[PDB]
Short mmCIF file of C-alpha atoms and ligand atoms in Angstrom, two decimals:
data_model
loop_
_atom_site.label_atom_id
_atom_site.label_comp_id
_atom_site.label_asym_id
_atom_site.label_seq_id
_atom_site.Cartn_x
_atom_site.Cartn_y
_atom_site.Cartn_z
CA UNK A 1 -81.26 43.04 33.15
CA UNK A 2 -78.45 42.62 35.87
CA UNK A 3 -76.22 40.30 33.69
CA UNK A 4 -76.83 42.63 30.70
CA UNK A 5 -75.80 45.63 32.82
CA UNK A 6 -72.53 43.77 33.68
CA UNK A 7 -71.85 42.86 30.09
CA UNK A 8 -72.29 46.52 29.05
CA UNK A 9 -69.99 47.60 31.87
CA UNK A 10 -67.49 44.99 30.76
CA UNK A 11 -67.49 46.38 27.24
CA UNK A 12 -67.14 49.90 28.51
CA UNK A 13 -64.17 48.98 30.66
CA UNK A 14 -62.42 46.90 28.02
CA UNK A 15 -63.06 49.27 25.02
CA UNK A 16 -63.16 52.88 26.34
CA UNK A 17 -59.54 53.56 25.20
CA UNK A 18 -58.97 50.77 22.62
CA UNK A 19 -58.66 53.25 19.65
CA UNK A 20 -59.83 50.43 17.35
CA UNK A 21 -62.96 48.39 16.79
CA UNK A 22 -63.81 46.73 20.14
CA UNK A 23 -66.88 44.86 21.43
CA UNK A 24 -68.30 42.21 23.80
CA UNK A 25 -70.90 39.73 22.74
CA UNK A 26 -73.07 37.42 24.87
CA UNK A 27 -75.97 35.05 24.61
CA UNK A 28 -77.67 32.61 26.97
CA UNK A 29 -79.97 29.81 25.57
CA UNK A 30 -82.29 27.29 27.15
CA UNK A 31 -80.53 23.97 26.27
CA UNK A 32 -83.72 21.89 26.00
CA UNK A 33 -85.87 24.35 24.00
CA UNK A 34 -83.29 26.59 22.33
CA UNK A 35 -85.14 29.69 23.60
CA UNK A 36 -83.02 32.81 23.75
CA UNK A 37 -83.06 33.91 27.38
CA UNK A 38 -80.93 37.10 26.97
CA UNK A 39 -78.28 38.57 24.66
CA UNK A 40 -75.94 41.41 23.94
CA UNK A 41 -74.75 41.99 20.37
CA UNK A 42 -75.97 38.47 19.41
CA UNK A 43 -75.57 39.03 15.66
CA UNK A 44 -72.15 40.75 15.57
CA UNK A 45 -69.06 38.79 14.47
CA UNK A 46 -66.13 37.75 16.71
CA UNK A 47 -63.01 35.62 16.11
CA UNK A 48 -63.71 32.02 17.36
CA UNK A 49 -60.13 31.39 18.29
CA UNK A 50 -59.86 27.96 19.97
CA UNK A 51 -63.68 27.75 20.53
CA UNK A 52 -63.76 26.38 16.97
CA UNK A 53 -62.13 23.19 18.21
CA UNK A 54 -65.50 21.96 19.51
CA UNK A 55 -67.05 22.41 16.06
CA UNK A 56 -64.01 20.60 14.52
CA UNK A 57 -64.47 17.58 16.71
CA UNK A 58 -68.22 17.68 15.94
CA UNK A 59 -67.24 17.32 12.25
CA UNK A 60 -64.85 14.48 13.11
CA UNK A 61 -67.54 12.70 15.17
CA UNK A 62 -70.01 13.09 12.23
CA UNK A 63 -67.53 11.24 10.01
CA UNK A 64 -67.06 8.58 12.66
CA UNK A 65 -70.84 8.11 12.87
CA UNK A 66 -70.92 7.76 9.06
CA UNK A 67 -68.09 5.04 9.15
CA UNK A 68 -65.68 7.35 7.45
CA UNK A 69 -63.41 7.71 10.51
CA UNK A 70 -62.49 5.77 13.69
CA UNK A 71 -61.89 7.06 17.21
CA UNK A 72 -58.96 4.63 17.43
CA UNK A 73 -57.18 5.48 14.21
CA UNK A 74 -53.58 6.44 14.98
CA UNK A 75 -51.96 9.46 13.28
CA UNK A 76 -48.17 10.02 13.21
CA UNK A 77 -46.50 13.29 12.53
CA UNK A 78 -43.13 15.00 12.59
CA UNK A 79 -41.56 17.63 14.78
CA UNK A 80 -41.74 20.05 11.89
CA UNK A 81 -45.61 19.85 12.00
CA UNK A 82 -45.69 21.21 15.56
CA UNK A 83 -46.94 24.77 15.83
CA UNK A 84 -47.25 27.20 18.83
CA UNK A 85 -48.99 25.79 21.85
CA UNK A 86 -48.77 22.04 21.34
CA UNK A 87 -48.54 20.80 24.94
CA UNK A 88 -49.92 17.37 24.29
CA UNK A 89 -48.91 16.61 20.71
CA UNK A 90 -45.23 17.44 21.31
CA UNK A 91 -45.22 14.61 23.87
CA UNK A 92 -46.20 11.97 21.27
CA UNK A 93 -43.71 12.40 18.45
CA UNK A 94 -42.74 8.75 18.61
CA UNK A 95 -46.13 7.18 19.25
CA UNK A 96 -48.42 9.53 17.40
CA UNK A 97 -52.00 9.91 18.71
CA UNK A 98 -55.35 8.42 17.97
CA UNK A 99 -58.23 10.60 16.68
CA UNK A 100 -59.89 10.29 20.08
CA UNK A 101 -56.61 11.50 21.79
CA UNK A 102 -56.37 14.37 19.31
CA UNK A 103 -59.87 15.61 20.05
CA UNK A 104 -59.21 15.26 23.83
CA UNK A 105 -56.00 17.36 23.27
CA UNK A 106 -57.66 19.91 21.08
CA UNK A 107 -60.62 20.48 23.42
CA UNK A 108 -59.24 19.85 26.93
CA UNK A 109 -55.77 21.39 26.44
CA UNK A 110 -56.33 23.69 23.43
CA UNK A 111 -53.58 21.91 21.56
CA UNK A 112 -53.00 23.69 18.20
CA UNK A 113 -51.14 20.90 16.34
CA UNK A 114 -53.95 18.47 17.37
CA UNK A 115 -56.48 20.83 15.75
CA UNK A 116 -54.42 21.05 12.54
CA UNK A 117 -54.03 17.27 12.41
CA UNK A 118 -57.75 16.88 12.81
CA UNK A 119 -58.40 19.57 10.20
CA UNK A 120 -56.38 17.40 7.76
CA UNK A 121 -58.52 14.34 8.52
CA UNK A 122 -61.72 16.12 7.42
CA UNK A 123 -60.18 18.01 4.46
CA UNK A 124 -59.33 21.42 5.91
CA UNK A 125 -61.08 24.66 7.01
CA UNK A 126 -63.26 24.62 3.87
CA UNK A 127 -64.72 21.23 4.91
CA UNK A 128 -65.36 22.34 8.48
CA UNK A 129 -67.22 25.31 7.10
CA UNK A 130 -69.14 23.04 4.70
CA UNK A 131 -70.14 20.71 7.52
CA UNK A 132 -71.45 23.74 9.49
CA UNK A 133 -73.35 25.18 6.57
CA UNK A 134 -74.87 21.80 5.78
CA UNK A 135 -76.39 21.68 9.32
CA UNK A 136 -77.89 25.13 8.87
CA UNK A 137 -75.26 27.48 10.35
CA UNK A 138 -74.46 29.67 7.40
CA UNK A 139 -72.67 32.33 9.47
CA UNK A 140 -69.80 30.50 11.19
CA UNK A 141 -66.67 30.12 9.03
CA UNK A 142 -63.22 28.71 9.41
CA UNK A 143 -60.77 29.91 6.76
CA UNK A 144 -57.31 29.41 8.19
CA UNK A 145 -55.26 26.86 10.15
CA UNK A 146 -53.55 27.24 13.53
CA UNK A 147 -52.11 29.60 14.53
CA UNK A 148 -53.00 32.14 11.84
CA UNK A 149 -56.75 31.83 12.51
CA UNK A 150 -56.20 33.86 15.78
CA UNK A 151 -55.10 37.03 14.00
CA UNK A 152 -58.30 38.93 14.82
CA UNK A 153 -57.79 41.78 12.34
CA UNK A 154 -60.50 44.28 13.14
CA UNK A 155 -63.65 43.61 11.20
CA UNK A 156 -62.13 40.72 9.21
CA UNK A 157 -64.84 38.05 8.91
CA UNK A 158 -62.34 35.18 8.44
CA UNK A 159 -62.51 32.57 11.24
CA UNK A 160 -65.50 34.26 12.91
CA UNK A 161 -68.91 33.38 14.37
CA UNK A 162 -71.78 35.29 15.94
CA UNK A 163 -72.92 34.61 19.45
CA UNK A 164 -76.29 33.36 18.34
CA UNK A 165 -74.86 31.18 15.55
CA UNK A 166 -72.35 29.56 17.85
CA UNK A 167 -74.84 29.01 20.66
CA UNK A 168 -77.38 27.51 18.29
CA UNK A 169 -74.76 25.33 16.66
CA UNK A 170 -73.41 24.13 20.00
CA UNK A 171 -76.97 23.23 21.08
CA UNK A 172 -77.54 21.20 17.87
CA UNK A 173 -74.23 19.31 18.38
CA UNK A 174 -74.73 18.51 22.06
CA UNK A 175 -78.48 17.68 22.09
CA UNK A 176 -79.77 17.52 18.51
CA UNK A 177 -79.65 14.69 15.97
CA UNK A 178 -76.49 15.73 14.12
CA UNK A 179 -74.45 13.23 16.06
CA UNK A 180 -75.41 9.90 17.53
CA UNK A 181 -76.25 9.91 21.21
CA UNK A 182 -72.82 8.24 21.83
CA UNK A 183 -70.95 10.83 19.80
CA UNK A 184 -72.85 13.86 21.28
CA UNK A 185 -71.91 12.49 24.74
CA UNK A 186 -68.27 12.20 23.76
CA UNK A 187 -68.25 15.79 22.60
CA UNK A 188 -69.71 17.08 25.92
CA UNK A 189 -67.38 14.81 27.91
CA UNK A 190 -64.34 16.35 26.29
CA UNK A 191 -65.72 19.79 27.10
CA UNK A 192 -66.41 18.72 30.66
CA UNK A 193 -62.79 17.77 31.04
CA UNK A 194 -61.51 21.17 29.82
CA UNK A 195 -58.31 21.97 31.71
CA UNK A 196 -57.39 25.47 30.55
CA UNK A 197 -60.42 27.64 31.24
CA UNK A 198 -60.13 27.92 35.10
CA UNK A 199 -60.10 31.72 35.27
CA UNK A 200 -63.29 32.16 33.24
CA UNK A 201 -66.71 30.77 34.00
CA UNK A 202 -65.36 27.93 36.16
CA UNK A 203 -64.11 30.53 38.67
CA UNK A 204 -67.70 31.47 39.37
CA UNK A 205 -69.29 28.05 39.36
CA UNK A 206 -71.02 26.93 42.63
CA UNK A 207 -70.73 23.51 44.23
CA UNK A 208 -72.88 20.85 42.61
CA UNK A 209 -73.01 22.53 39.24
CA UNK A 210 -72.10 20.93 35.87
CA UNK A 211 -69.97 22.74 33.29
CA UNK A 212 -68.66 21.65 29.86
CA UNK A 213 -66.79 24.46 28.16
CA UNK A 214 -64.12 25.59 25.72
CA UNK A 215 -62.20 28.85 25.94
CA UNK A 216 -60.27 30.83 23.32
CA UNK A 217 -57.63 33.63 23.21
CA UNK A 218 -56.16 35.32 20.22
CA UNK A 219 -54.47 38.49 19.08
CA UNK A 220 -55.78 42.01 19.35
CA UNK A 221 -57.66 41.50 22.56
CA UNK A 222 -59.62 38.49 21.36
CA UNK A 223 -60.95 36.17 24.17
CA UNK A 224 -64.05 34.03 24.51
CA UNK A 225 -65.77 31.00 25.98
CA UNK A 226 -68.62 28.68 24.97
CA UNK A 227 -70.29 26.53 27.63
CA UNK A 228 -73.12 24.19 28.54
CA UNK A 229 -73.80 24.46 32.30
CA UNK A 230 -76.37 24.01 35.03
CA UNK A 231 -77.05 23.28 38.69
CA UNK A 232 -77.49 19.79 40.08
CA UNK A 233 -75.00 17.89 37.97
CA UNK A 234 -76.61 18.51 34.57
CA UNK A 235 -76.37 21.28 31.96
CA UNK A 236 -79.49 23.24 31.29
CA UNK A 237 -78.26 26.43 29.48
CA UNK A 238 -75.78 27.41 26.82
CA UNK A 239 -73.60 30.52 27.34
CA UNK A 240 -71.44 32.13 24.71
CA UNK A 241 -69.20 35.17 25.51
CA UNK A 242 -66.77 36.80 23.11
CA UNK A 243 -64.69 39.96 23.06
CA UNK A 244 -62.29 41.42 20.56
CA UNK A 245 -60.31 44.63 20.10
CA UNK A 246 -59.39 45.58 23.74
CA UNK A 247 -55.81 46.75 24.61
CA UNK A 248 -56.29 45.42 28.16
CA UNK A 249 -54.02 42.58 29.37
CA UNK A 250 -55.05 38.91 29.68
CA UNK A 251 -55.78 38.96 33.42
CA UNK A 252 -58.09 41.97 33.04
CA UNK A 253 -60.01 40.39 30.17
CA UNK A 254 -60.28 37.13 32.16
CA UNK A 255 -61.62 39.01 35.17
CA UNK A 256 -64.36 40.73 33.07
CA UNK A 257 -65.52 37.46 31.64
CA UNK A 258 -65.48 35.81 35.13
CA UNK A 259 -67.57 38.76 36.33
CA UNK A 260 -70.14 38.21 33.60
CA UNK A 261 -70.15 34.53 34.71
CA UNK A 262 -70.67 35.49 38.36
CA UNK A 263 -73.59 37.65 37.33
CA UNK A 264 -75.28 35.02 35.16
CA UNK A 265 -74.86 32.51 38.07
CA UNK A 266 -76.21 34.86 40.75
CA UNK A 267 -79.09 35.90 38.52
CA UNK A 268 -79.79 32.47 37.03
CA UNK A 269 -83.42 32.41 38.21
CA UNK A 270 -85.51 29.32 38.58
ZN1 LIG B 301 -73.81 28.59 3.65
#
């Protein structure tokens, strides 16, 4: 009840004077069992923003497992392929990057060109969506490339998920049989090394805890985070938080998410 109070308070603060569709969504799952521990608007849609990049690399790893792709395959590209927010890819115009390096860049640094390059390797947004639907997530959809997929037009379902869908999908990728044990470990390792989510859940994380996460930010107030975390050096729950529609600035939206994190940590229970 305490984390749920905070999530409602967060939404009230962020949306009161938005003058457009505005919401917060949250779900917490038991990692081992998949049991839904608590939720707030679990079945409402939100823009994924860069949180999709985990699902993208899941699709890539599936192809690697199937012998259709190699972690070490090198991809070259041109300066004209670089889109907004390409901190890693723009440093490798000469050398290109391997598929492994691209996934590290997409997940750990939120590199947009790396995501587009990876989308190409699997056949585009439609094939990411196909991969998701084929593993039983018929809600999540990627429709556009970077950066247009961050547009966050109110109530547009393009490039959206639901908290429950994302959380359930994340659980299947990280601990189910969709990927080999080696690939599922690679996926969580990239998330563990996330470099660009400090002001969100990581800001509330106690010493000794494990976190593997991926953040997102888009237009029209959109912000979110997906995570696997737990005490004692191992993840034991999945957390997904999304918001869209607020007119509040970045730092304020960050603070509200970090506050939800602090609550869910304080009130973790056994
Ligand atoms: Zn479907």
